Amino acid sequence: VSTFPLKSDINITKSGKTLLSVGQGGRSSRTGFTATVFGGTGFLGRVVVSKLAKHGTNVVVPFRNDRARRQLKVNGDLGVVNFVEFDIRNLKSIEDSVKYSDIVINLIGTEHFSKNFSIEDVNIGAAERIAKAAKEAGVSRLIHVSSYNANPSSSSDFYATKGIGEQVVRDNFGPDATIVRPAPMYFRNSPFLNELLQIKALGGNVIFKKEVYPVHALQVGEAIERIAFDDATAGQTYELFGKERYSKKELREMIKHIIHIGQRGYYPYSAGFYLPAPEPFLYAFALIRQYISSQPRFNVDQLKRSHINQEIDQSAKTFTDLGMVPDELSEYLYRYVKPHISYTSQTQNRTVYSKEDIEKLRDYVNTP
Amino acid sequence: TDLAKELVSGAPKELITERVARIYQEAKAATQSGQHNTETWKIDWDILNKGNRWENDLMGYQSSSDYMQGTILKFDTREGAIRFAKGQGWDYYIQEPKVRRFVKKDYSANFY
Amino acid sequence: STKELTTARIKDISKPDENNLQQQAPNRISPWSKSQKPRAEAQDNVRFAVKDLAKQPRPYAAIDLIYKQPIRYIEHDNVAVCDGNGGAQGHPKVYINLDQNKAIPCGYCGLRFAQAAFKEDIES
Amino acid sequence: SGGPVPVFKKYTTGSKGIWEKIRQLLTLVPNRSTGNPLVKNYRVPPPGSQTLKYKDPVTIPAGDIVKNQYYDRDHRRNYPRLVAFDQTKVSGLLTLGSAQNPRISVGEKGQKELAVFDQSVSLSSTLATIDPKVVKSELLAEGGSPVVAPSLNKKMKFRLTEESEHGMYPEDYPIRIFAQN
Amino acid sequence: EEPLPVLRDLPRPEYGELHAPVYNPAEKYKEQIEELHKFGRYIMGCLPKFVQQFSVWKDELVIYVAPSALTQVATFLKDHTSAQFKACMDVTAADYPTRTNRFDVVYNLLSVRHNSRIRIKTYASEVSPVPSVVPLFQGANWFERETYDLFGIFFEGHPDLRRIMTDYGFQGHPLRKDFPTTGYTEVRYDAEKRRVVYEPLELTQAWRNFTVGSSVWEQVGDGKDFTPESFKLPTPAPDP
Amino acid sequence: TNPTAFAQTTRYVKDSTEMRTLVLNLYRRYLRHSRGFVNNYNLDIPASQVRTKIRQEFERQRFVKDLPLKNVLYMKAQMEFQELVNFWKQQCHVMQYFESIKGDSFVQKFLKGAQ
Ligand SMILES: NC(=O)C1=CN([C@@H]2O[C@H](COP(=O)(O)OP(=O)(O)OC[C@H]3O[C@@H](n4cnc5c(N)ncnc54)[C@H](OP(=O)(O)O)[C@@H]3O)[C@@H](O)[C@H]2O)C=CC1
């Protein structure tokens, strides 16, 4: 964020346009850039739209949910945030979103498949169509967000389609496409933290054994702001991850002590905080809810991913190439699990967990 | 006089370390023969080198970030203006008003 | 040709098309002021991407309408008096000198007045 | 006096025939109006369809073409001047008197006394050494009586009235009605 | 049983050319001006130690006192039988940056007893203390709080002095002449922080200063003198 | 009319020595309520960081010499103390108060526009 995001007030795009910024960098200021944020109504999308629009950059937000786009307009001044009703199966709608854009950020991706879209259609088909449409519109910069374990030869549908998505985007848009591989992101209402905060987490012995390198979502959106406005980042791949490795079981137990579920010894077991189930049963339950439940549940592919840990591609670039220091989960863990605390309510004394308190709590969890 | 009244005024520190005020007496307009506006001393601030004015692209409005751009203080004497500027700890400079030299003017001079 | 759509001219070198949405006005192609932004350039904005240009407000150009009014010729008088042809609902009443051998417009309405003795000279 | 008025004298829509007789029987106060404006009388000529020909009203002394010099009616530029009385001028008025009742010597002997009050002269010192009859006649009033704060309106009197006059709540309610008197 | 008359059709009076008196509105105050001069002089005579000066404008009397004399004059004007100003209707201030003491602190008193109003004027700086008339008039509690909030005047002896108009933690005193009309900061909702935050002020359209179009000619002259004849220094008789 | 909780009567102290004691007395009251500030406003920092912040703000006026300025500074500090203890401030204001954050070279300001 800061007070002025650009490193200079004059920027020349890859397509030759000269863009001049006006103002000190506030709501009424402008940067001269127009950006399209595909999937701007999602979790990461709202962070990206907020950062771009708060400094005056024009943001075009294609959308399919009419109620979800309303809160995005508050980020920018009048005329800054624009909306286009779009569908990845409508070519004309996508071409209208990128017609006036200098930067296109593709945040569209899914871990589930539904009655209308498969994993291939969103992770590969949508990315290819957006990338090819951006090039025909003469967009200077394209930013695609893949997954952390993107590998075209992976046995998981999510990781494989993300790996193919990286290659199909570079073929269509060209060598000037920047690819971002973010780790699981922690933030308010973060999907990575929502699963850990769920009291009745079925099959926690099979799912919560995955080890990851969680990264702050605010930094991921900040990194995208750096990448979009820096042409030196074109054609590169960025792996965004934290320094400290964590297992979901450690996070699950650390959260359990922060929420003070253990104030009553019987309660965590009675309330269902532990639901040990065989993996074949979890596979059957995940398979059934893939065709009965109308809401995306824990599906078959996510069961496979519980056995796959996050491996970091060493050749790719990191926060150091962008001049940033990754945030530590221990610093921000308390403020993002604070809403789920049982009672608190300043009864006697709030137990504020600092950076050192969280690290000590990690030792207690692993202490038998 | 010596009291640093800016410590209690509540104004931001940028008024002292980044802005320059001008103490001046308004010059007589060349299009009018009135001199009423020249009888008072006024204080205004120099424009910001950047962000003083920029064009809003939606409607062509004159956007600005200078919060002192429309503030002009009025004083009855030069000494009062200096005393107030010193009291607030402002970086200022005085523009001395130009005085008109007196020359005798009579109708007889049209022929002599 | 985008040169007649973005440059101020006294007259349009072609016939305006009422159905053309790139014209400055439905009855006029070119803009009528040097500082008037061309309509074609204005509509080339991100805010017109998914907007129908036909329903946008396109009032008729007043400069073309005022010159369709015939010149008022005054008989046996070198001074013309105009107040907007409405009286209390018009404009302040002004007096126009007609000594010169040309039509002189009103300062408010733009209606042009001249003497009848100069009618032959003005029309040719 | 605003006594009770029959219902048909009020500009509201009423009842007719048998329905008027029924209303009188059932209503506790039959002379009250329903509050619905008469469709045939209320706002029947709308303000946009009035036939009146309006003319700007002008008074003769201040809006005529003759005997109408502006400075004769220029009250804005003839505003009262702001005069402040300090203890020096009050001492001068007390010692030398006023122009209405002069008590200052004549000629050059009088201008010496005037020049005394051109610099600071305390009123306490002036009151300390002065004839007491002056204070009882100039500073005080009615031979030493204190100066009461002057009223903003000398015609602001009141008189207590009874219900038969003002028509408001009777004497058992805890309010009273005061007239102009 | 009779139908109601049509008020539109009722006949209306016919008027010729109307006439109206032309007189100075200040003429109707001739009794008020002289009475207030005598009462204002009576207060100075009763309190030579405190009353710096007094002025009379039409029907308004103003008493000018030092900050160290505010309590005594207000106490006198409240408890004296001839001047029973029990009600303090307003306490306000005005900023005059030219003077050594910027602020004029103004007290408007009302006497329902004698149907009279009086005004007390004192002065203050940004740091000089002013006695609080809250012990005398309990209704001045909020007015003095408002004066401090918008000016910053130090009211010594106020039982609970704090902000009453500005936001909590507001910086600056808006009614000072050097305070910009738009302030220094503005608020908005930050999506990242999930709360409303203060940010430095930026205006999409800057406030346009049309006050520079003031007339270059003086509009009102020196005015007319309305001092009572009983309050003018006498002119001595001429030479013999 | 009863004054609100934690309300002090405004007074102009004419002794520099007495003013020092009043500041010290008010300084301890801020430290004692540091945990209350954390609990009431639900801060993300421990009470130890609050006391460090309170000390830093007090040290900014340590070398103020003019007595009339001290009375205004002390009076406003009492008003600030009353505002925080009585929970009159909204939680957003206190969060932003602790959300306060090497300068750029000449060229870095020059390339971006500076001020
Ligand atoms: N911990 C994490 O969240 C991680 C994120 N990623 C990837 O980052 C990107 C951002 O996702 P995130 O914000 O984090 O969480 P989400 O999965 O909720 O974001 C998905 C976004 O893509 C849109 N989307 C999905 N399918 C479609 C579709 N058929 N048509 C149109 N839009 C679609 C969604 O739009 P809508 O909301 O309107 O349905 C939404 O805006 C994703 O691609 C994700 O795979 C990868 C690793 C870690």
Ligand SMILES: [Zn+2]
């Ligand atoms: Zn005309």
